[PDB]
């Protein structure tokens with residue numbers, strides 16, 4: 001089942017409100033045709049260059065950032081083009097990225113909320129219609145709707161009364177979330 005970690009700073013917030021707020025600060029990195037010419041809006045994989053246990057990206061509008069974790073693969077120019085697929089186990093949201101390929105992998109200087117044990121697996125055959133692709137590309141483009149929908153489905157799988165409209169504290173009372181220090 002899904003496992004959620006959240007800073008106590010967000011206790012009485014619902015999952016939906018947090019994601020809408022984080023997405024508002026992250027914005028859209030404009031990772032679209034003809035607009036990706038360098039590493040300013042590509043993000044990066046660990047180990048990379050196009051496959052890894054982590055994909056991380058910082059906003060070009062603020063210092064908001066996220067890290068997707070699992071067994072991820074990006075097709076780039078091969079068919080189906082520009083598709084992220086594979087297994088997505090976690091999404092960590094926060095502020096300011098650190099790491100790369102030295103002391104280890106990627107991390108967030110301030111990790112606000114994370115969703116783990118997602119259990120998502122999208123085969124390459126699904127192309128951009130796969131859930132993994134929609135979830136991550138949505139985050140890159142300022143539309144966390146796909147992530148919100150998947151989290152909602154995973155919470156309802158635990159109990160039909162849970163939802164992204166539930167406060168993080170209610171999810172902790174349900175045994176699905178765990179509060180971490182204000183900082």
Ligand code: HEM
Nearest residue numbers: 031032033034035036042043044049050082084133136137
């Ligand atoms: C190493 C990281 C990445 C690099 C170097 C990269 C590079 C590129 C480039 C150069 C383009 C432009 C293509 C063009 O002008 O025709 C592009 C487009 C695109 N990329 Fe990436 N990308 C990366 C990661 C990702 C990830 C993780 C996703 C999905 C979650 C993604 C989704 C897309 C999509 C949907 C397009 C639009 C293609 C279209 O509309 O035809 N990219 N990418």
